[PDB]
From a paper:
Most TA systems are composed of two components—a toxin that impairs an essential process in the cell and a cognate antitoxin that restrains the toxin activity.
The asymmetric unit contains two VapD and two VapW molecules. While the VapX antitoxin binds in the cleft between the two cognate VapD subunits and occludes the catalytic site, VapW binds on the opposite side of the VapD enzyme. Each VapW chain simultaneously interacts with both VapD subunits.
Numbering used by the authors:
A (entry chain A), B (entry chain A): -1 to 104
C (entry chain B), D (entry chain B): -3 to 107
The structure:
Amino acid sequence: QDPGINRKAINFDLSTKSLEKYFKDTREPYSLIKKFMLENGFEHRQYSGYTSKEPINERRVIRIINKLTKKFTWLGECVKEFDITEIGEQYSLKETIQDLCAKDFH
Amino acid sequence: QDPGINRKAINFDLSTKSLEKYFKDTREPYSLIKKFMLENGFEHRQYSGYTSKEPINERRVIRIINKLTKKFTWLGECVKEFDITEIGEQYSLKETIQDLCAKDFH
Amino acid sequence: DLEDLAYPLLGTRIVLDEEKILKEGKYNLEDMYKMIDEYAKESGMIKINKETYHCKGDKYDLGCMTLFIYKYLIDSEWFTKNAKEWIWISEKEGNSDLISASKAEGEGIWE
Amino acid sequence: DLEDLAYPLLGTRIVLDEEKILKEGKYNLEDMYKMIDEYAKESGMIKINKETYHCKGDKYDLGCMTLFIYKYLIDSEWFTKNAKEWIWISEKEGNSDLISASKAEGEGIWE
């Protein structure tokens, strides 16, 4: 499509003390955000963060974040960090690391 | 310096069941990797993962991962995912999100 | 040091419909531009010329663009109803028409 | 679909010191190249020509390069002692001399 447009990563950290003001079970807000993110073209990683399924330009990303903050206004009270990073390329090393620890060559 | 060379993100997920074979306290292996990563030019995020302090080329990154796997050979047994991603640009939205939830304009 | 100094350009080009503004006599054209300048100030934008504003080029670029476009300008009815041209400028990703996009997305009041 | 199809090139250029190999009579030159080809096969590399191997261009590129260069070739003494030129090729980041880098890093046996 348009090679200038990359995938995006969203990573954030919320304060548990501030989240307890609004939720008795602090696991719910993460579940609420998870649902919103999957609805808006992002997927949760098996490590941490939301990676866009497809490339998405910066204008559309910040519209999604605007939409998110209007939906959950307690985000402004609880956010400790919140970063958008441009993803240039993503490489998988799981099998390579398994290969290295095989001690079959020397 | 060399604009073609980006910062790198390292993100991984380990199996707790497999880690319990090698450590009674499964928090230690994460602390061991954290120390190695900070020694080799990466820093831990307040969300998850290791971001290189400076740009680092792919050759040097994979030498660091080789070094890591030779140091902790239990990594091959316990790794569930392990990704290197090229970082294109990183943007901070903490204060912007706080600004949006200010309801001072309309 | 030698690193972290060159972010790609983000900004916006603005052209008011000055003919419509004077012919209608609703607003004062000079105070529209002063209101736009004040918006750019509290969003952290740099004024290049009468039509053009740019980010500073650091890690806060996206947040500054979020405030200027999608907090202040888009919800200013006097602005959106009297804008002849509105462009989102991205060196890396290309430009786009903010008027056509905002009408299709339901952002702002245009008529 | 239309996405995820164009990874930047990673690969390596290899030139053996054929003159040294024959003059010394230690190894058979043809089986050196067959051993290199077998390494490229089990690392997932594509042979372009006698000197040149490339990754396939997908998310496993870095792992294939890790195996070919830093598991198989670098620990092959018959290889490192008889190599006239060894280049790490990266379209995006530029190329580098693997012989000079490996001697400075202590990777492999060169004399």
